[PDB]
């Protein structure tokens, strides 16, 4: 999932 | 209940620098990422950076149209986060709001929106 | 050049209902990056309004609602209120840009 990605989620 | 409270900002010279503290309270602050968002008068929203949990590194992400002159840390034993803002410039006038990042689960991964917002700290870049 | 815009103003009348488009891009919401939605009411700070695109917060009615399809996204708004009169505003992670991307807002006027 893209919404996994560390630059767009900071509790990734 | 929860707060954020920005405070420090005020008038400012052109390539000076200035310190936001953000202090959270009514939450387990360490956490959550906090993220700072800015408006200039009369404009939108623009976000400025993130900071990650303590357990993560407490590793920084901010915009392109800061990166280089603000920083973010932040200090879990008074929890509170800092914007440094540093070589300022006119148009980084605007109002800095302190934000919370949510830890709603989603499908497979953590929601990241910001869920609680202070009321924000007016900083105005003028010689 | 943005990567998400959005109307600058939309108006509807008193019970009527309006729709307010965030149009992105293939680096953002045609990505399968999640759109959040912020209300800002005039004056006050933003509060989120629907995240990971379609969810509510408790305390927000089901009289909003969100959506999303190929690069674009909606937020709907039934049973206007004039205390809905607020920028709304639309937010995506950018590949391209490589941060969270804020649309530019859209002014509601509810014509009482």
């Known amino acids: 999932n893209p919404n996994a990605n560390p630059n767009a989620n900071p509790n990734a | 209940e929860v707060q954020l409270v920005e405070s420090g900002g005020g008038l400012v010279q052109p390539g000076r620098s200035l310190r936001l503290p953000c202090t959270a309270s009514?939450?387990?602050?360490?956490?959550?990422?906090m993220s700072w968002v800015r408006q200039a008068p009369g404009k939108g929203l623009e976000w400025v950076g993130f900071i990650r949990k303590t357990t993560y590194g407490a590793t920084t992400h901010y915009a392109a149209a800061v990166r280089g002159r603000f920083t973010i840390s932040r200090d879990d034993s008074k929890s509170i986060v800092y914007l440094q803002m540093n070589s300022l410039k006119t148009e980084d006038t605007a109002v800095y709001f302190c934000?919370?990042?949510?830890?709603?689960?989603?499908?497979?991964?953590?929601?990241?929106?910001?869920?609680?917002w202070g009321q924000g700290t007016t900083v105005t870049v003028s010689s | 050049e943005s990567v998400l815009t959005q109307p600058p103003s939309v108006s509807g009348a008193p019970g009527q209902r309006v729709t307010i488009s965030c149009t992105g891009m293939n680096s953002n919401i045609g990505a399968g990056y999640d759109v959040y939605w912020y209300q800002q009411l005039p004056g006050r700070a933003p509060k989120l309004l629907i995240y990971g695109n379609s969810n509510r917060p408790s305390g927000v009615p089901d009289r909003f609602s969100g959506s999303r399809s190929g690069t674009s996204a909606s937020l709907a708004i039934t049973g206007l209120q004039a205390e809905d009169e607020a920028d709304y505003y639309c937010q995506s992670y950018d590949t391209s840009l490589n941060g969270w991307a804020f649309g530019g807002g859209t002014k509601l006027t509810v014509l009482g």
């Open positions: 009514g939450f387990s602050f360490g956490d959550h990422a």
């Open positions: 934000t919370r990042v949510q830890l709603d689960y989603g499908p497979g991964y953590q929601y990241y929106g910001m869920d609680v």
